[PDB]
Amino acid sequence: MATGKIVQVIGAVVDVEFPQDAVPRVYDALEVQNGNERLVLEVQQQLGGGIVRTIAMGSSDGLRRGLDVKDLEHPIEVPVGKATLGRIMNVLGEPVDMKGEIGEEERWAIHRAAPSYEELSNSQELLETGIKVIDLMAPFAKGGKVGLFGGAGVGKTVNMMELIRNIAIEHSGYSVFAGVGERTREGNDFYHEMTDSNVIDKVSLVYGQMNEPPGNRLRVALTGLTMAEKFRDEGRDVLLFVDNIYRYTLAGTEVSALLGRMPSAVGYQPTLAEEMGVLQERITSTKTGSITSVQAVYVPADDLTDPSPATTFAHLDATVVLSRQIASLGIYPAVDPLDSTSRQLDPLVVGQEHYDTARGVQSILQRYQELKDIIAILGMDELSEEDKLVVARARKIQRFLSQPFFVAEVFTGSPGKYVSLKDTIRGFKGIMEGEYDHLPEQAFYMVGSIEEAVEKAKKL
Amino acid sequence: QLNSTEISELIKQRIAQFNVVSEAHNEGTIVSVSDGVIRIHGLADAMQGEMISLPGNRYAIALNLERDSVGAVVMGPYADLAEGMKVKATGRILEVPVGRGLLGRVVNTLGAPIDGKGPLDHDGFSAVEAIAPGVIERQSVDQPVQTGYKAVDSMIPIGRGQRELIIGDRQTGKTALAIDAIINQRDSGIKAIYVAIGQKASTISNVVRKLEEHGALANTIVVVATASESAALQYLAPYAGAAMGEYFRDRGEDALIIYDDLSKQAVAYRQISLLLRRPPGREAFPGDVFYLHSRLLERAARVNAEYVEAFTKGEVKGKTGSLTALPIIETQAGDVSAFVPTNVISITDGQIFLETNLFNAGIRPAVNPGISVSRVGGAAQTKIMKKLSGGIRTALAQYRELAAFSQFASDLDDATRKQLDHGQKVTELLKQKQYAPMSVAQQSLVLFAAERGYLADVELSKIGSFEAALLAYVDRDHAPLMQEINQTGGYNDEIEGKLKGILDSFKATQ
Amino acid sequence: EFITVARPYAKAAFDFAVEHQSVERWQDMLAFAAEVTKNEQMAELLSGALAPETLAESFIAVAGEQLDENGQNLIRVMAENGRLNALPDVLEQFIHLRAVSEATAEVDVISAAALSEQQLAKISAAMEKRLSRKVKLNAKIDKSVMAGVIIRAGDMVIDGSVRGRLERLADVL
Amino acid sequence: GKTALAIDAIINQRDSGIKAIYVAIGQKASTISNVVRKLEEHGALANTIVVVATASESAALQYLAPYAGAAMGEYFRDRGEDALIIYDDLSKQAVAYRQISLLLRRPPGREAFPGDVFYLHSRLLERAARVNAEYVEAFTKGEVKGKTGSLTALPIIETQAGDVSAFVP
Ligand SMILES: Nc1ncnc2c1ncn2[C@@H]1O[C@H](COP(=O)(O)OP(=O)(O)OP(=O)(O)O)[C@@H](O)[C@H]1O
Ligand SMILES: Nc1ncnc2c1ncn2[C@@H]1O[C@H](COP(=O)(O)OP(=O)(O)OP(=O)(O)O)[C@@H](O)[C@H]1O
Ligand SMILES: Nc1ncnc2c1ncn2[C@@H]1O[C@H](COP(=O)(O)OP(=O)(O)O)[C@@H](O)[C@H]1O
Numbered sequence A: 001m002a003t004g005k006i007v008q009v010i011g012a013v014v015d016v017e018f019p020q021d022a023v024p025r026v027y028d029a030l031e032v033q034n035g036n037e038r039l040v041l042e043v044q045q046q047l048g049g050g051i052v053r054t055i056a057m058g059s060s061d062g063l064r065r066g067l068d069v070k071d072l073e074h075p076i077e078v079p080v081g082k083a084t085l086g087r088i089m090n091v092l093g094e095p096v097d098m099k100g101e102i103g104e105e106e107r108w109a110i111h112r113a114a115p116s117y118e119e120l121s122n123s124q125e126l127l128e129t130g131i132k133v134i135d136l137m138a139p140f141a142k143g144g145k146v147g148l149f150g151g152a153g154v155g156k157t158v159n160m161m162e163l164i165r166n167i168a169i170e171h172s173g174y175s176v177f178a179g180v181g182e183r184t185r186e187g188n189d190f191y192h193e194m195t196d197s198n199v200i201d202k203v204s205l206v207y208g209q210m211n212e213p214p215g216n217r218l219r220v221a222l223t224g225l226t227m228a229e230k231f232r233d234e235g236r237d238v239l240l241f242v243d244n245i246y247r248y249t250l251a252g253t254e255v256s257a258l259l260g261r262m263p264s265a266v267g268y269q270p271t272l273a274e275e276m277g278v279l280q281e282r283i284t285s286t287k288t289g290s291i292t293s294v295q296a297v298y299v300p301a302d303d304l305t306d307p308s309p310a311t312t313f314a315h316l317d318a319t320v321v322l323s324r325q326i327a328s329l330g331i332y333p334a335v336d337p338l339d340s341t342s343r344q345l346d347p348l349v350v351g352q353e354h355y356d357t358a359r360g361v362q363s364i365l366q367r368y369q370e371l372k373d374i375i376a377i378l379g380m381d382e383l384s385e386e387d388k389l390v391v392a393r394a395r396k397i398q399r400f401l402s403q404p405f406f407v408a409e410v411f412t413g414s415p416g417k418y419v420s421l422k423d424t425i426r427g428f429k430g431i432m433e434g435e436y437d438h439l440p441e442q443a444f445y446m447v448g449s450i451e452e453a454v455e456k457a458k459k460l
Numbered sequence B: 001q002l003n004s005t006e007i008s009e010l011i012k013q014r015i016a017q018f019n020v021v022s023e024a025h026n027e028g029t030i031v032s033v034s035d036g037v038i039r040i041h042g043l044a045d046a047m048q049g050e051m052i053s054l055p056g057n058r059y060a061i062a063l064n065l066e067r068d069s070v071g072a073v074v075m076g077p078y079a080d081l082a083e084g085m086k087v088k089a090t091g092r093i094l095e096v097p098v099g100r101g102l103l104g105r106v107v108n109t110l111g112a113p114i115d116g117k118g119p120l121d122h123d124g125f126s127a128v129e130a131i132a133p134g135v136i137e138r139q140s141v142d143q144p145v146q147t148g149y150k151a152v153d154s155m156i157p158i159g160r161g162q163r164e165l166i167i168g169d170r171q172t173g174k175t176a177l178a179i180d181a182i183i184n185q186r187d188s189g190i191k192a193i194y195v196a197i198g199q200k201a202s203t204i205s206n207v208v209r210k211l212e213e214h215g216a217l218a219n220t221i222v223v224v225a226t227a228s229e230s231a232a233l234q235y236l237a238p239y240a241g242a243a244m245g246e247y248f249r250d251r252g253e254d255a256l257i258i259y260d261d262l263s264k265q266a267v268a269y270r271q272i273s274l275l276l277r278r279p280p281g282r283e284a285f286p287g288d289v290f291y292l293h294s295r296l297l298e299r300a301a302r303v304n305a306e307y308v309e310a311f312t313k314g315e316v317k318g319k320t321g322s323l324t325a326l327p328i329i330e331t332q333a334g335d336v337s338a339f340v341p342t343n344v345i346s347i348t349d350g351q352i353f354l355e356t357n358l359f360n361a362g363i364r365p366a367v368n369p370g371i372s373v374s375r376v377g378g379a380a381q382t383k384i385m386k387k388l389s390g391g392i393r394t395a396l397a398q399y400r401e402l403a404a405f406s407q408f409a410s411d412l413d414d415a416t417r418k419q420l421d422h423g424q425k426v427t428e429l430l431k432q433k434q435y436a437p438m439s440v441a442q443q444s445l446v447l448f449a450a451e452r453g454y455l456a457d458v459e460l461s462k463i464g465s466f467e468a469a470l471l472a473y474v475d476r477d478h479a480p481l482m483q484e485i486n487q488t489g490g491y492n493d494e495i496e497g498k499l500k501g502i503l504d505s506f507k508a509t510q
Numbered sequence C: 001e002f003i004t005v006a007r008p009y010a011k012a013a014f015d016f017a018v019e020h021q022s023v024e025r026w027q028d029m030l031a032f033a034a035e036v037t038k039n040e041q042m043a044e045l046l047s048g049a050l051a052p053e054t055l056a057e058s059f060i061a062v063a064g065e066q067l068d069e070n071g072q073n074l075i076r077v078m079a080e081n082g083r084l085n086a087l088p089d090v091l092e093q094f095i096h097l098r099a100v101s102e103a104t105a106e107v108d109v110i111s112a113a114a115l116s117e118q119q120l121a122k123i124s125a126a127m128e129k130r131l132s133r134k135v136k137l138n139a140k141i142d143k144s145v146m147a148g149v150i151i152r153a154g155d156m157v158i159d160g161s162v163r164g165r166l167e168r169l170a171d172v173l
Numbered sequence D: 001g002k003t004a005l006a007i008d009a010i011i012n013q014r015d016s017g018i019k020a021i022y023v024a025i026g027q028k029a030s031t032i033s034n035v036v037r038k039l040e041e042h043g044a045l046a047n048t049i050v051v052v053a054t055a056s057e058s059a060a061l062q063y064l065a066p067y068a069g070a071a072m073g074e075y076f077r078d079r080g081e082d083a084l085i086i087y088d089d090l091s092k093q094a095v096a097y098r099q100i101s102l103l104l105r106r107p108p109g110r111e112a113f114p115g116d117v118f119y120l121h122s123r124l125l126e127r128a129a130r131v132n133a134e135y136v137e138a139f140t141k142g143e144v145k146g147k148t149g150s151l152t153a154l155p156i157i158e159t160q161a162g163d164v165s166a167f168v169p
C-alpha cells in the first residue's frame, strides 16, 4: 500500500508528503508509477511536517502532483555475489544487457559503514601484480588506492584488462568495474574487447552513463563498491576499478547544487571532503580480505591545487603515469618510471633490497635523461667511458621494462609472461651490478625475466 | 514573511466552499506574467514537460510543479497575456513533425515552416524529449564522413555516429567549416540538419542562400530559433533537431546534425532557470547544465542492425543507422577552462580547435593540429587516407619543434633543413578555399604528392598553383582512376604505381 | 510583523461578510479566534511544525463558537499557509475596514483637564467636516500638558498644547 | 615528513617524564592504525593518549577531537605536570567547520571559510601554556605546591604548492 503523495516536482528534485508517523528515514528508496514504469526516488532530506525531499533516479518527466508513493523501508539494494560476474548493471542493479534476469542470491544495501578500527588488518602487504614496471617502481599495497594519470592512446584499457586477468588467474580474486560517467560508445567498446580477450567472466561491470540524471552518476560508484565488499567477505582479494573519480566529484557537486546548499571554494559542494572519505574509507584491507582500487584521475585545468585533486591525492597510495612518449619507442606498458611513485617504496615496507634496486634504477634513468641533452647538443664524443657505460645500462634497463601481456597476444603475437617481484628485482639488480652487461640491448626487449633474456641472447 | 499566492478573491472562494477540488483538474488560470514566465493556479493534473494551451493558439511548457501553482514558460510572444486568462492542459508532451518531406524546408523549433513554401508533408510526430539507445544497442563506428577539407579529413577523421566538437574563438570559421561539411554530403547518402540557435535572421537567410547556391539545400533540414524568439524556443530547439535526425537513424539511414552555438542554448537555459528561481551553480548556470548537454549529445550514436530491425518491425533488416553531431562551442578569449566549454569537452569524442592567430596568418582553415584530436581515429578513415595521413601527422609533429629554429635555420643539419622545408610545404598545402570541398580522390592525390617527396623541389610560394594544375590535369586525362578511388578508397600496389605514373607524367608539364 | 500578511485574509473575510450581511458575527468569531491563539499551550502547539491539516483540525476542536461553514474554511485556509498567528492582526484590519466602510472614525482628545460638553460638540462638528465621516470622540486628558489640547485622528495631529508652544518656541534658537 | 617529525618527538619523550597526546583529525584509519602500531613497537604507547577522528566520521566529531585533546592535556597542565599534544591536520578541522558552517547558511569570508575561523584555532591553541605555581596551588586547592604545569602543542598545517601565504596557514 502506497502511503505518500507527491507535492512538488522541480526538475530532478521531487518532494513527497507522508503521514507524520511514517516519514521515511534518510537514504531510503521510494518508488512511483511514472506512466508505465516504476521510478525510484532516493530520500535526501527530511523537511518539517512530514514532507520529504528526494532525488529521482531516472527521468522525472510525466510526474503529476498527487501521485501515490510506495515507501520501500530499505535503502537501495543491489544483487551481489558470483551471479553478477559478466553482467552489465545500472546503479539500481537492473541488467542493462539483454541477457535476462540475474540469478541473485542476496541483495545488499549500498549505504554501509566503514570497517571498524578493530577489523582492519594488522599488517602491510604488497599486492604482486606481475607487471615489472608497476611491481618495481610503484608497488601496490593490499587495500591501497592507485591513480592512473595517463591520457588516451597510452594503453590504459589494456593495462586494466591485464590487471584483471592477472588477479583472476594468478591470484584467486575477482574484479569490479564502476563506469562513473561513462561514454556509451566507449562502454560498448570496452564490453566487446573484454569479451574478445575472454576476461569478461572474471569481472563484474556496473555502468552509469553520462545521459543519466546526476543521482545515478553519483551513486553508481557505491553499487560497485558494495559488490566488491560482498566479494571481500568471501575472503578473496578484489580489484575495484573507478573509471573517473572526478566525475563522481562533479556528480556530487551537481546534486548539492540541485538541493540548493551553499557552495564552497571554487564552487564545490561543502561536503566534498566527507563525500570523498565515505567512498575511499571503505576500500581497505580487512582481516577477512582486502579491496584494492585503481582510479583514473583527471586534473580540471592541469591545476594540482584545485580542491578536487587536492582531496583525491590525500587518499592515493601510489601514482602510475602513462606517457605517449614512451609508447613512441614501442615500449609497453607505457609507464613512466620517473614520475610514477608509491609511498610503499620505503625500506621499512618493501625491504632494503627492493628499495635500493628501485632507487638505483631511478637514478640511472635520471642520469640518462641528463646525458641525452649532452648527446644531442654536442655529440657522443663528449661522453666519457664511464658515462657511455651508464648510457648503455640505462638503455638496457629502459628496454627491459617492456613486457608481453596475455591479453595483448593479438598485437605482439608472443605469449604473455608473468614476472614475480623477486625475479624482476634480481634481474634489475643484476643489470645494475654489471652482470649481463655483455648481452645485446635487444635481448632485454619484451623478453620477460632475465633467465629468458639470456636464452634470447643465445639466438638473437 | 511574504505572501505566496494568497490573494483576496481566491481566499474568498475558499471561504465560500473549501473543497474547490470539485472543479476539473484539466484547467487553471494565470496569476502572474513576467519576462516570459507565467504562474498558473490550478492544473492539478499537470505533469513535467506538458504542453499547456494558451489563448491565441500558443503553448507553454510546465517546468515547475509547485505545491500551489505551476510555473510555465511561453513558447512565443508573451506581452499580451494577462492574469485571469483561462488555460487548459493538453495531455501531450512536446512533439514535432518528422519525415522526409521536411528536407529542403526551413522550420522553427515547433515544426512550423517559416520559408513561405506552404505546409509540411510529414510522417507523423516524435517526442522532443527522448532517451538515447542503451549500451547494448550501440555499434562501433567504422564508417567515414567526409568534410571535404584536407586537414580535417586527414588528421581528424569523423566517423558516422561520432560527436566532433568544433570549438574556437569568434570569427574563426566554425560556421564556414560546418556548412562546408554540410555541402560535401550533397552527393552522399548522409542527410544534413542545420540547427540555428540565437543567430540573427539575416545570417540564417544568407546561409540558406549559400546552401541553395551550391545545391545542398535539397538534402538539408533547417531549424531556426532567431535571437528575438522566446528563450524556451532557443533552448528546446536543438532537441527538436535531434528528434528530426533520430527519424532517419532508427530506420537504418545516416544523418548529420549540426548544432550552432550550443553556448547560446546554455545561456537561454540559464535565463529560464533563473527566471524560475532555481538555485544557481558556478557562473550562474543551474546545477544540471551538464545533464542538459549530455543527454542531448548522447543521442548521436550508431545502432546495430538488430535495433533497426526491432524498431521498424522487421521491415528493414540489413541496415545499421547513425546520427552524427557537430556541436559548436565559442571560447571567449581562448579559454577552454570555462564551465560550458569544459562540459562539452568532457562529453564529445573529439575536438577541432580553430585558432584566431592561425586565421590571421595565411592558413584560412585555421585548424590547429597537436591540440585537435579525434578519439575514433583511423577506424573512421578509408584505407588509402589512413595509409597516407600518418606521413602528414609525423611531418607536422616534427615541423612544430623546428619552427623555433626557423629564425636562424641557415646553420643547421641538412636533415633538419629538409624536415623544416617539408613541414613548411605541408602546412602551405593544407590551406584551402572556402566552399570548395575536395573529393577523397583529390585529397588522396595531393597527400600522395606531398608525402612521396614530389614537392621537394617545388617552391613554397607556388604550392597552390601546383595543386590546382595537378587537379585539373588528373580531371582531364585520368578521370577513371579518380572514379575508382571515389568509389572504393582502396589502396594497393596497382594503385600506387598508377599514382606514380600520374605524378611523373604531370611533373613534365607546368 | 504579521501586518502585511494579514491584509488579504481580512479583506476577503470582510467582503464575504458584506455579501452575506453578517459582519458583526464575523467580528465576534474573529475575536474568539484571536483569543484561543493566545492560549499558552495553543501557542506551543502553533509553534511546533505539525502538518497543516492536523493543526487545523486540532484548532477547530478548541472552537465551538465558530460558524463552521465559513469560519472553519477561514481557519483551514490560514492553516495551509501557517498564518494562524496572524489572527490578532486580521481582526484589527477587519475592524479598520469595517470602520472605513461605515464611514466612521475614532478620534482621541488629550488636554490638561476635562473638557465641557460644548467644546466636545464643537470638536466633533469640526472633525466631521474635516474628515467627511462620522466621528466618535474619546478623552484621555494627561498629567503632563499644563494647558491646551491635542486632537489626533488617524495619524493626522493638531497640537494646541502650551507644551507644544513652549518647545516650538525654543526651536527658534 | 610532517607526521614523522612529530611522532619522533612523542617517542623521544618516552623517558623524559612528559605525557603525550596524539590527535588524528580526518586521517585514514589505516594510517592511524599504523602509527599506533609504531608507537607500541618503540614502547611510547604506554605514555600516549590517541584521539581518533577518521576521514569518514561526521564533521561534528572532527571538532570536539582537537578540543577534547586540549582538555585531556589541560588535566595534566592544571595538576602541575607536563604534557605534549600534537594535533594532526588542523587544516582538516578547518574544512570541517566550513561544512558545518555552510550547512548552517552562515556567510563565508575569504576563500569559503567563515570569519570565525580565526577564533576557532585561536581558542584551541591558546590553551597550551605554562602556568606559574600559584595557579597550580589555587586549582589543586593546596594539594600541590611549588610546581609549574605546562602543555606543549605542535599543530600541523598542510600547504598547497608550498604557498605559505594562503589564508589558513
Ligand atoms: N577557408 C576559408 N577561406 C577563406 N575565407 C574563409 C575561410 N573560412 C572562413 N572564411 C571567412 O572567415 C570569416 C568568418 O567565417 P565564419 O562566419 O564561418 O566564422 P565563425 O567562427 O562562425 O564566426 P562567428 O563567431 O562570428 O559566428 C568569413 O568572412 C568567411 O568567409
Ligand atoms: N628522517 C627521514 N629520513 C627518511 N625518510 C623520512 C624521514 N622522515 C620522513 N621520511 C619519509 O617521508 C615519507 C612521508 O612521511 P610522512 O607520512 O610522515 O609525511 P607527511 O607529510 O606526514 O605525509 P602526509 O602529508 O600524507 O601526512 C615516508 O616515506 C617517510 O618514511
Ligand atoms: N603489449 C602491447 N603491445 C603492443 N601494443 C600495445 C600493448 N599494450 C597496449 N598497446 C597499444 O595501446 C593502444 C590502445 O590503447 P587503449 O587504452 O586500448 O586505447 P584508449 O586509451 O583509446 O582506450 C593500441 O594501439 C596498442 O598498440
Ligand SMILES: [Mg+2]
Residues within 6 Å of the ligand: B174, B175, B176
Ligand atoms: Mg559563425
